[PDB]
Amino acid sequence: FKVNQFRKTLRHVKNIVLRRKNKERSLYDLTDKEDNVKPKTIVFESFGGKNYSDSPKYIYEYMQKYYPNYRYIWSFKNPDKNVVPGSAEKVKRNSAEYYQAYSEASHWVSNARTPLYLNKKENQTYIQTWNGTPLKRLANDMKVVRMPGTTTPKYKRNFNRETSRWDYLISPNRYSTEIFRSAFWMDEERILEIGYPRNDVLVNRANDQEYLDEIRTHLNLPSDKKVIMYAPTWRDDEFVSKGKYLFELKIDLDNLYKELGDDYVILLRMHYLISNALDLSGYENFAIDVSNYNDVSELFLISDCLITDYSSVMFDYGILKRPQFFFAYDIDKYDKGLRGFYMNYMEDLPGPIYTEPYGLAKELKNLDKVQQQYQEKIDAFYDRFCSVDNGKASQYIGDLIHKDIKEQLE
Amino acid sequence: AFKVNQFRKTLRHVKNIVLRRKNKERSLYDLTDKEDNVKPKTIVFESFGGKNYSDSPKYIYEYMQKYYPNYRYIWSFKNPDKNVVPGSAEKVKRNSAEYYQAYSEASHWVSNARTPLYLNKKENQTYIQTWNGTPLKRLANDMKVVRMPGTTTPKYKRNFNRETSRWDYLISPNRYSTEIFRSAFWMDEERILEIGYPRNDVLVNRANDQEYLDEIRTHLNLPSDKKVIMYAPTWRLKIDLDNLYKELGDDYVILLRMHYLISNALDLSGYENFAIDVSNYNDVSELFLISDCLITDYSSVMFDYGILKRPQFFFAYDIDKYDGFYMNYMEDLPGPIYTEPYGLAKELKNLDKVQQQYQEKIDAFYDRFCSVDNGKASQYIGDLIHKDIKEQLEH
Amino acid sequence: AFKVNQFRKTLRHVKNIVLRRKNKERSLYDLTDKEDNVKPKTIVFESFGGKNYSDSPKYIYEYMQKYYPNYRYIWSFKNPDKNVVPGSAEKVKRNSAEYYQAYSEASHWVSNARTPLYLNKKENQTYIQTWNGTPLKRLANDMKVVRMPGTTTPKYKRNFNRETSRWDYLISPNRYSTEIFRSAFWMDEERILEIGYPRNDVLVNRANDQEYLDEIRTHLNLPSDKKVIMYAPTWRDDEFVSKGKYLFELKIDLDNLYKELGDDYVILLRMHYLISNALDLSGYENFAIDVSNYNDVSELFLISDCLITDYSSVMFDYGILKRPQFFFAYDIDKYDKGLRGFYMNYMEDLPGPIYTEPYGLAKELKNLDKVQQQYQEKIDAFYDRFCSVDNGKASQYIGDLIHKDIKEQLE
Amino acid sequence: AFKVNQFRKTLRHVKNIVLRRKNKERSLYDLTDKEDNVKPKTIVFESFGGKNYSDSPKYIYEYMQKYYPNYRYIWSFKNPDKNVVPGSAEKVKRNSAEYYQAYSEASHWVSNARTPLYLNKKENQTYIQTWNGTPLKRLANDMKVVRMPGTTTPKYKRNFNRETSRWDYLISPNRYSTEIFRSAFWMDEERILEIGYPRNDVLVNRANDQEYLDEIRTHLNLPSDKKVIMYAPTWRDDEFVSKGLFELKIDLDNLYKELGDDYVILLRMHYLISNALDLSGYENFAIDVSNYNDVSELFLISDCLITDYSSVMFDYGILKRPQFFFAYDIDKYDKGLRGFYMNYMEDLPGPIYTEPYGLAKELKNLDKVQQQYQEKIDAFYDRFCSVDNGKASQYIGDLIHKDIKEQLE
Numbered sequence A: 001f002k003v004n005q006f007r008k009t010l011r012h013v014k015n016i017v018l019r020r021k022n023k024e025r026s027l028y029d030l031t032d033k034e035d036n037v038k039p040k041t042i043v044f045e046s047f048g049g050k051n052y053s054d055s056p057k058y059i060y061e062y063m064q065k066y067y068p069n070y071r072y073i074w075s076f077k078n079p080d081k082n083v084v085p086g087s088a089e090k091v092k093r094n095s096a097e098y099y100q101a102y103s104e105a106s107h108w109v110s111n112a113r114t115p116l117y118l119n120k121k122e123n124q125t126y127i128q129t130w131n132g133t134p135l136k137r138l139a140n141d142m143k144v145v146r147m148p149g150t151t152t153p154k155y156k157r158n159f160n161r162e163t164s165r166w167d168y169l170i171s172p173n174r175y176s177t178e179i180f181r182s183a184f185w186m187d188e189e190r191i192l193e194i195g196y197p198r199n200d201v202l203v204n205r206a207n208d209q210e211y212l213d214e215i216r217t218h219l220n221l222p223s224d225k226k227v228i229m230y231a232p233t234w235r236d237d238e239f240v241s242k243g244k245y246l247f248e249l250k251i252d253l254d255n256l257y258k259e260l261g262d263d264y265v266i267l268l269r270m271h272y273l274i275s276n277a278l279d280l281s282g283y284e285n286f287a288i289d290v291s292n293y294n295d296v297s298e299l300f301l302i303s304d305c306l307i308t309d310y311s312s313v314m315f316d317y318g319i320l321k322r323p324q325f326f327f328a329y330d331i332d333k334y335d336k337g338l339r340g341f342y343m344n345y346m347e348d349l350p351g352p353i354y355t356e357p358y359g360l361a362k363e364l365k366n367l368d369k370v371q372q373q374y375q376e377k378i379d380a381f382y383d384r385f386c387s388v389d390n391g392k393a394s395q396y397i398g399d400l401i402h403k404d405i406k407e408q409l410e
Numbered sequence B: 001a002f003k004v005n006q007f008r009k010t011l012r013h014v015k016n017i018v019l020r021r022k023n024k025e026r027s028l029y030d031l032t033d034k035e036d037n038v039k040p041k042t043i044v045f046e047s048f049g050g051k052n053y054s055d056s057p058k059y060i061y062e063y064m065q066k067y068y069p070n071y072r073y074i075w076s077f078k079n080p081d082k083n084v085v086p087g088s089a090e091k092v093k094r095n096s097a098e099y100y101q102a103y104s105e106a107s108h109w110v111s112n113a114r115t116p117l118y119l120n121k122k123e124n125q126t127y128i129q130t131w132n133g134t135p136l137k138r139l140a141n142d143m144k145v146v147r148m149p150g151t152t153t154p155k156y157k158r159n160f161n162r163e164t165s166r167w168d169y170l171i172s173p174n175r176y177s178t179e180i181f182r183s184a185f186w187m188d189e190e191r192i193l194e195i196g197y198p199r200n201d202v203l204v205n206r207a208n209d210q211e212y213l214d215e216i217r218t219h220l221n222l223p224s225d226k227k228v229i230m231y232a233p234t235w236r237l238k239i240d241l242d243n244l245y246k247e248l249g250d251d252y253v254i255l256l257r258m259h260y261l262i263s264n265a266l267d268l269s270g271y272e273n274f275a276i277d278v279s280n281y282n283d284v285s286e287l288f289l290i291s292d293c294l295i296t297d298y299s300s301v302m303f304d305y306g307i308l309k310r311p312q313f314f315f316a317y318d319i320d321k322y323d324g325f326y327m328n329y330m331e332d333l334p335g336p337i338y339t340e341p342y343g344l345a346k347e348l349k350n351l352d353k354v355q356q357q358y359q360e361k362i363d364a365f366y367d368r369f370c371s372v373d374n375g376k377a378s379q380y381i382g383d384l385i386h387k388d389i390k391e392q393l394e395h
Numbered sequence C: 001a002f003k004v005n006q007f008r009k010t011l012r013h014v015k016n017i018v019l020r021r022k023n024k025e026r027s028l029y030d031l032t033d034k035e036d037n038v039k040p041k042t043i044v045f046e047s048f049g050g051k052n053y054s055d056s057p058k059y060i061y062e063y064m065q066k067y068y069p070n071y072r073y074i075w076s077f078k079n080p081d082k083n084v085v086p087g088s089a090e091k092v093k094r095n096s097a098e099y100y101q102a103y104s105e106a107s108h109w110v111s112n113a114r115t116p117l118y119l120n121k122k123e124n125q126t127y128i129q130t131w132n133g134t135p136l137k138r139l140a141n142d143m144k145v146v147r148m149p150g151t152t153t154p155k156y157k158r159n160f161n162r163e164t165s166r167w168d169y170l171i172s173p174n175r176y177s178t179e180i181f182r183s184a185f186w187m188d189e190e191r192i193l194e195i196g197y198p199r200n201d202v203l204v205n206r207a208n209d210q211e212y213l214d215e216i217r218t219h220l221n222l223p224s225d226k227k228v229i230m231y232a233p234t235w236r237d238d239e240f241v242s243k244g245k246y247l248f249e250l251k252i253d254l255d256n257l258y259k260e261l262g263d264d265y266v267i268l269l270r271m272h273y274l275i276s277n278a279l280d281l282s283g284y285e286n287f288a289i290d291v292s293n294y295n296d297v298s299e300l301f302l303i304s305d306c307l308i309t310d311y312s313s314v315m316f317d318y319g320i321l322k323r324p325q326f327f328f329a330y331d332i333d334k335y336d337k338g339l340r341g342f343y344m345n346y347m348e349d350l351p352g353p354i355y356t357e358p359y360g361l362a363k364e365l366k367n368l369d370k371v372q373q374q375y376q377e378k379i380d381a382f383y384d385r386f387c388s389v390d391n392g393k394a395s396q397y398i399g400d401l402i403h404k405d406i407k408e409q410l411e
Numbered sequence D: 001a002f003k004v005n006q007f008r009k010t011l012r013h014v015k016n017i018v019l020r021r022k023n024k025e026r027s028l029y030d031l032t033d034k035e036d037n038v039k040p041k042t043i044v045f046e047s048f049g050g051k052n053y054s055d056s057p058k059y060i061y062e063y064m065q066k067y068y069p070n071y072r073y074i075w076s077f078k079n080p081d082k083n084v085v086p087g088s089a090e091k092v093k094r095n096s097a098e099y100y101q102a103y104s105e106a107s108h109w110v111s112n113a114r115t116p117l118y119l120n121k122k123e124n125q126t127y128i129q130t131w132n133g134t135p136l137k138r139l140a141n142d143m144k145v146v147r148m149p150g151t152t153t154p155k156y157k158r159n160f161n162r163e164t165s166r167w168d169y170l171i172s173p174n175r176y177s178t179e180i181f182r183s184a185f186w187m188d189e190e191r192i193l194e195i196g197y198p199r200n201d202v203l204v205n206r207a208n209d210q211e212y213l214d215e216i217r218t219h220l221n222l223p224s225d226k227k228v229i230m231y232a233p234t235w236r237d238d239e240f241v242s243k244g245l246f247e248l249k250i251d252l253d254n255l256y257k258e259l260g261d262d263y264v265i266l267l268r269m270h271y272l273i274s275n276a277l278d279l280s281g282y283e284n285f286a287i288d289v290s291n292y293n294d295v296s297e298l299f300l301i302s303d304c305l306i307t308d309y310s311s312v313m314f315d316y317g318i319l320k321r322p323q324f325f326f327a328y329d330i331d332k333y334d335k336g337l338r339g340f341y342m343n344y345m346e347d348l349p350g351p352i353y354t355e356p357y358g359l360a361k362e363l364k365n366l367d368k369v370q371q372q373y374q375e376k377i378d379a380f381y382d383r384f385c386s387v388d389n390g391k392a393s394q395y396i397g398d399l400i401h402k403d404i405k406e407q408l409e
């Protein structure tokens, strides 16, 4: 009668008798053991189960094609609101079947921290794609984290606890690799430098004019107009009035309409909270709201340029060697020249920094003149961050997972 | 304000859990079980501590299934997989989490035996007891000594009383019985229901419905050219089969029915088509319908069966070693009392002389014990419940 | 880290503490009890489940007091206040922490009656059982049916067997008992010690101590010029009625015994405790002396000229003195008719006559010497069968065995 | 009718007991702690979380011993075998089955610090918080930020609040302190008893008792005709190096040379400096007095005190003697600061010295200082010490007495 089973035992009795929602958890913690692991089961969860998206979707769509043999499971917050191509079955987070899947699977494929109350036995391979080349410093490399209810010492403790269980961690480049090694308490031995499976499309399908054409019309865009994508990161600073009416984006849509409304159409990819607060009346067929569009890689494929500021997306869009524009209107805030960035923002990035929208809007007319002026910085930016990606990432992982559960079949 | 009972049920449950006892199911139920778990539209049935789909609960249930089909029905069995139940009723294995939930939720318990004391009969649940026959041998309270297995005469009665107090309604077959029940079971006449037994329903409504009698007989594989004798001894070879075969094999076939277990020792080889073992058959009342006479000794089947005003024979081989019954046994019963089988056989050879010779003693018996059965009984319980579950489904 | 049995105890003790149960002293005793607790020179005495300071324990201990004041002696009592103990021994109340400390710590347990199954007799301690006398009524296993509510015949026997399997040593007063014991108690002859009862010691060593007889005699305020009869019926339930407030005078007819024996006898009445404090001996003063309370019955014998009893284990102890006995069995023609509930043959091999009526007992009881003579026949042969094995050294044999035990347990 | 809370405690306790956890005594307490266990005649005392027999709980106790011997007194300690209590009182060890009994039964809790939140203060018991001094540094609610590990500033404050809500009465030294407690401790002013510290009664009743002074002086083997300087600096975490020193910044060696003849100096250091302090060759000059069981006595026999950022200044103030504030490290402390409730730069009873040589040459003439600052010294007394009338010990014990009378009916 072991002291660890006894604690998990009493915990569960309390959950069962008190009608706690976690009884599902407490049960799972008890019965869990190596023997439940069917080597041909794979669970996928993307961004903590909000979506069917990103790199697990592609590590998935690849395996569905070349390895339909296996049991595929997807984990979701709300499974009845998620469309999944293929054989895979879906599970609601924190339910019976959720802990089942996770107990039984021989491979965890995920792109974000998966919870700690889930048991990753010495027996299951947990593959971590993570979600992008870092620009803001993260995990260990942070300095202070006043995130409510926890302390910097403790939030790093738990994060280290998670990374410790990552059997594999994907990396898009030598710069991310060097960062993860420190930021994530990672051994170089465990890192795969293969590029992002979500980015696979950015190499393989970028000139597939039919695919480009579906996406365009799925979005209902003018057939004659080029496409700008604007994806500003979030700012607590700018949240006012409970979120009922915001000051028209500091980019000035009215102007953008005036100046580009004839050649261009602009895609707004905002944080989900600015999205259902942004009224786009009389911008119809000019500014298209694109914030909830499931797959971002597709939005890049049909974009002639990206306007962002401080985001890990510029590193993705980089693969297409198109012109970027960094509209850092609030840059004066951010530390006056911050080491809070792994890279030199001021110097090496593929486009101009604008602090005001009007200089930007004029330059945004003649894109071809922008591609010239910057072919220099753009190429150099491609060399450094985007050179690893060859569109074989989904293949590499799916094959790994295959190479893995063939040995295990003995 | 320390809740002293709850604390005991907890420790118990915490101990059943750690030592991995089978009763973990039970200590949970006992801890968790609140009056709020009760679903008005949920009714449980157990028959004979859950060996059968049989008897008064079957019939009460088969009735309710047709006229009140919307209620949720649960049956309790020792082994559900070996029992087949008609209709929307779901089965539950005993001592299983499903068993306890069932009994905790149920608004009505229907049984014909004692339900266990570890089960809690709340103030808002209605426990209907049908019991299981008209008593001959003394029972419950009225018993003198009962050196049962690992129990004392009082600790055994102390417990019966704890059981009979839980009974909200107790079904009675005949005045004779109600008088006995009131003492035997500590009961108050209010809670008693002199309405006959639901199980006997068919013994009035279907005694002449012939196609039915013909489905029973061919469901058993019986010779079309033979009268049927049913031997239902009672409790723990004697009748001389070899002799009954040489005496009766040309007019009769004989059904042998036990109460317990001896059955798989009756190697009836060479008595095929004559001695039919009918021990494991479900509905006894059916057997009576196709039975031309019945041989018994001290069973209470003798009162149920008497309802058909057929002949009975009481083969009391062990009467000498029995000195105490609620009625005068030597004197007034519907048939001859034989202590050897050899004169039983000869007098069983002509059934009609026995009928006339006893048609007076038969009627006297019918008019005492069977003058109460309508066949409406089954109905009357079904209704009672339905009624009892509109009240508890309103204000 | 946790074994299954200690868990059960742990949880019991939790229930006792939170719920404020008096048994808490026990649940604790049960957790904390271990072989390392034993003090080789601590010995515990209890007699008749702790009601008394009496019988074979008293004597085995009085011997050890004189010849071994070195050891720790603890006596057990229901009420240690109401009992007087001569010497070094300390008193402990049943069910107090002391009680359990004592029984946990003791290297030896001396007793003359079943000690509770809840106490743990470790592989470590020696439990000497003296028992309380030669059987006439069949006991323990040899019983047929035993309907004392709370327990069934096989449960009762199981519980008995458990307790005797714990007995390391079982004193025997004679081979008659040894025969019986072996069966009734599930005994292995190895463990039986035919040495005679320690309480009976003084029935040998001191049958003549005329300053001793005189000390007892004047303790009871007994007349100077009168012989002593002692009546000592067993308990019979037939007679309990009316709250036990007022009983029906003794069947033996006192008013008669007075008329007949008064001028020459004083009769000691040793009744049950319930008949005593419910018996009006007014006007019988100096003839009938109530004696049911007296602590030491062996002393009562030493000073008795005859002994009227009926079916009691006492005839055997008394037999040691080769004195006349009478067996006033006024209700014998109820007991079985022909009784197999007794081991010995009653109608035959007892040392005096059987009377069913008091009246001829009283007469015949007039000339003692004519009975001592007429019956010397049976009286001697009775002695040879039951009393031949006592030598007055029983206390000393048990004293020395214990000592010899806690000299070995001293290494 | 399921009692959910009781169930939780029952599980917790079973967990502890089976797991052989040292806290079994705690979880049993909590399981059974009923409002009935309280016995009106019982009073528990504890000072500074049971490290001492000292401070105001002491003086409240010693009073109630002279006038109310009737009651049951219990003292809580960490290590009772190492503490000595005059009188009837019984001693319990902390977290020991007796400890929890004591608080279970007691009708009154007397303490000068925080009592554990595991202990249940029933609405049946009166909890008297004497606290431990006029605050100079901002505390509890008024604190800006507390990076003290395991716990964040919100959760640290949240717990301090949980505690102060169980304070039935809270003692206050002065109007300044009362305004502060009302906020810093989330207090209802109705619950503040402005009577001064019982620990400071002796500073009023016994400053003139020459036989008392002598006992204290001969208890500390003090030379005879030497004046007495007392040094009591708060705890600097910065000044700790090499497993624990650079000779105290005050320079004893200079202090010896300038004062050796006429003064003896009492060092009241923090326990960790104290057993790191080598005094080889300052005997009969520098007396380590760090573990002296009663600080207010030390005040009585001191002709002046050198402190810095300590609450002690407020207490030594009742005596109107000179004070010096050797605040050498005042640089590091905010430059021009607001970390303190009062203006540390303006309205204290003495000179601020950042070097200990101005201090030395000034300590030479004690008459001169007294004259010089008599004004500042009086404006200090008027503000912070005008309450202490030295009947504080009495006022509290008489409330406790009054309090347990009303119970007995």
Ligand SMILES: Nc1ccn([C@@H]2O[C@H](COP(=O)(O)OP(=O)(O)OC[C@@H](O)CO)[C@@H](O)[C@H]2O)c(=O)n1
Pocket (backbone or CB within 6 Å): B131, B132, B133, B134, B135, B136, B139, B232, B233, B234, B257, B258, B259, B284, B298, B299, B300, B301, B304
């Ligand atoms: N050989 C038998 C005897 C009886 N029964 C069935 O079991 C019932 C009980 O009959 P008893 O022989 O009297 O059994 P008992 O448990 O002794 O009940 C007697 C007492 O309950 C009277 O109410 C009968 O009505 C009948 O339905 C049966 O299947 N086979």
Ligand SMILES: O=C(O)CN(CCN(CC(=O)O)CC(=O)O)CC(=O)O
Pocket (backbone or CB within 6 Å): A007, A010, A011, A012, A014, D008, D011, D012, D015
């Ligand atoms: O083991 C138990 O369940 C008893 N304990 C355990 C508490 N629960 C809380 C939880 O579910 O997170 C289990 C535990 O943490 O050990 C109750 C208590 O200490 O509060």
Ligand SMILES: O=C(O)CN(CCN(CC(=O)O)CC(=O)O)CC(=O)O
Pocket (backbone or CB within 6 Å): B008, B009, B011, B012, B015, C008, C009, C011, C012, C015
């Ligand atoms: O064995 C036990 O732990 C004690 N209980 C049995 C366990 N259950 C049953 C009960 O409630 O009677 C309760 C308990 O664990 O305390 C009965 C007893 O006191 O020996």
Ligand SMILES: [Cl-]
Pocket (backbone or CB within 6 Å): A001, A002, A003, A004, C001
């Ligand atoms: Cl372990």
Ligand SMILES: [Cl-]
Pocket (backbone or CB within 6 Å): A038, A039, A040, A041
């Ligand atoms: Cl598999």
Ligand SMILES: [Cl-]
Pocket (backbone or CB within 6 Å): A077, A093
């Ligand atoms: Cl979630």
Ligand SMILES: [Cl-]
Pocket (backbone or CB within 6 Å): A077, A078, A079, A080, A081, A092
């Ligand atoms: Cl859903």
Ligand SMILES: [Cl-]
Pocket (backbone or CB within 6 Å): A118, A119, A120, A121, A165
């Ligand atoms: Cl893990």
Ligand SMILES: [Cl-]
Pocket (backbone or CB within 6 Å): A131, A132, A133, A134, A312
């Ligand atoms: Cl990232």
Ligand SMILES: [Cl-]
Pocket (backbone or CB within 6 Å): A150, A154, A155, A158
């Ligand atoms: Cl966290």
Ligand SMILES: [Cl-]
Pocket (backbone or CB within 6 Å): A174, A175, A384
């Ligand atoms: Cl690099």
Ligand SMILES: [Cl-]
Pocket (backbone or CB within 6 Å): A247, A248, A249, A253, A278, A279
């Ligand atoms: Cl806008």
Ligand SMILES: [Cl-]
Pocket (backbone or CB within 6 Å): B039, B040, B041, B042
């Ligand atoms: Cl319902």
Ligand SMILES: [Cl-]
Pocket (backbone or CB within 6 Å): B078, B079, B080, B081, B082, B093
């Ligand atoms: Cl089954």
Ligand SMILES: [Cl-]
Pocket (backbone or CB within 6 Å): C012, C016, C023, C026, C027
């Ligand atoms: Cl117990």
Ligand SMILES: [Cl-]
Pocket (backbone or CB within 6 Å): C038, C039, C040, C041, C042
């Ligand atoms: Cl010893």
